[PDB]
Amino acid sequence: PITGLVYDQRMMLHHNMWDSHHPELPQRISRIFSRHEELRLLSRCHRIPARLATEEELALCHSSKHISIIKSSEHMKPRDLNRLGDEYNSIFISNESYTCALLAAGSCFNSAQAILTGQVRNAVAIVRPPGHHAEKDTACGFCFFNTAALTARYAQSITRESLRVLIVDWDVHHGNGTQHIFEEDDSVLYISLHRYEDGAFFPNSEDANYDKVGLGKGRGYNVNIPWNGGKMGDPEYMAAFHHLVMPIAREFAPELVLVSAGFDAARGDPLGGFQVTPEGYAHLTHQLMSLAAGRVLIILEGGYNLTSISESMSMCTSMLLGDSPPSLTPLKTSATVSINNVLRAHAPFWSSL
Numbered sequence: 001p002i003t004g005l006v007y008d009q010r011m012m013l014h015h016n017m018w019d020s021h022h023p024e025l026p027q028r029i030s031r032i033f034s035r036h037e038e039l040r041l042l043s044r045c046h047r048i049p050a051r052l053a054t055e056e057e058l059a060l061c062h063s064s065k066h067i068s069i070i071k072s073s074e075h076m077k078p079r080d081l082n083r084l085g086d087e088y089n090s091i092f093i094s095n096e097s098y099t100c101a102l103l104a105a106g107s108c109f110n111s112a113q114a115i116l117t118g119q120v121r122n123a124v125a126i127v128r129p130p131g132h133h134a135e136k137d138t139a140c141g142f143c144f145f146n147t148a149a150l151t152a153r154y155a156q157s158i159t160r161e162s163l164r165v166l167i168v169d170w171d172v173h174h175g176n177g178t179q180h181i182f183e184e185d186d187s188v189l190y191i192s193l194h195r196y197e198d199g200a201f202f203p204n205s206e207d208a209n210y211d212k213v214g215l216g217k218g219r220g221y222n223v224n225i226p227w228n229g230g231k232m233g234d235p236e237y238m239a240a241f242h243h244l245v246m247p248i249a250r251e252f253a254p255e256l257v258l259v260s261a262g263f264d265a266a267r268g269d270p271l272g273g274f275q276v277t278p279e280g281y282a283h284l285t286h287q288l289m290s291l292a293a294g295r296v297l298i299i300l301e302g303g304y305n306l307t308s309i310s311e312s313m314s315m316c317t318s319m320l321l322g323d324s325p326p327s328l329t330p331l332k333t334s335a336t337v338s339i340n341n342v343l344r345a346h347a348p349f350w351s352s353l
């Protein structure tokens, strides 16, 4: 068994020139990488090369219009970069942004290809900027192209149209773009746990509520697990995996598992307010590894506490490498309510619930 790892310093070039302390920092990926070195996890992995996604690969999920406007920013003046960035919800743009978003998608394509052709069994991708908020026609929430959605489609392009792909999004924010891209799709199962607060939490839409189960052929194939009422942690996430995520994934029988692995639900995160521990992310990784013959790709998304996200993603890689999971309580009342609301809403589609 070989675990793959992809990381390219060039993805650090994406930067906010008006606010050097914006939390989507270049140092997010370099701090994670260094800790993988310090923990001797990088030497245990097979290094997968990064590459630029092609426009034809970007068109798998994104419209020509959206690609060409993000593309045009590569040659923009700072005034135009500021104006363009302000046109979106929570976006900053620099001249290198487009390039880095291409590298983040291509790095994951290469990783999914390594998994699917048997070169590695599983893989971890330390990439930025994130993508789960990116729609087919819009950039949003620090995301430009939806790296996880593109990798699902890329994976099917190099295998077959009907490849079954499970995207688990344990980023603290709802992946609105991933849900929308696959909302009418029964070949890609989307499962998102996320702080909701009746829509008061970013991305601030009721599309994230438990009653959004998909559309058309895709009904049943979108599972939203929204949290209400303050800090959640390991017990809430483990119970959601026990009653929901893992029963549904087993009935779905994914052939490939992609993890939209934001770490902004970890303690110390200012954009999450949760307390999921590094040991908890290790158990979520371990449980997902029981699916799809272990074919798991962990794609970095959010996560803004440099220490918490380096510790957390290190724990996940260690689980992929096969290390014994570490030792790891009553749920808050609203978490019980959230879980049973998802349970009742998806009972029609998943008989094992």
Ligand SMILES: O=C(CCCCC[SeH])Nc1ccccc1
Pocket (backbone or CB within 6 Å): 090, 130, 133, 141, 142, 171, 173, 202, 262, 271, 301, 302, 303
């Ligand atoms: O939280 C965000 C964006 C964070 C997205 C997580 C990307 Se994974 N933006 C905001 C907008 C208005 C007021 C307060 C915050």
Ligand SMILES: [K+]
Pocket (backbone or CB within 6 Å): 169, 170, 171, 172, 173, 174, 175, 192, 193, 194
């Ligand atoms: K999520």
Ligand SMILES: [K+]
Pocket (backbone or CB within 6 Å): 182, 183, 184, 185, 186, 188, 189, 190, 214, 218, 221, 222
């Ligand atoms: K779906």
Ligand SMILES: [Zn+2]
Pocket (backbone or CB within 6 Å): 171, 172, 173, 262, 264, 301, 302, 303
């Ligand atoms: Zn997030």
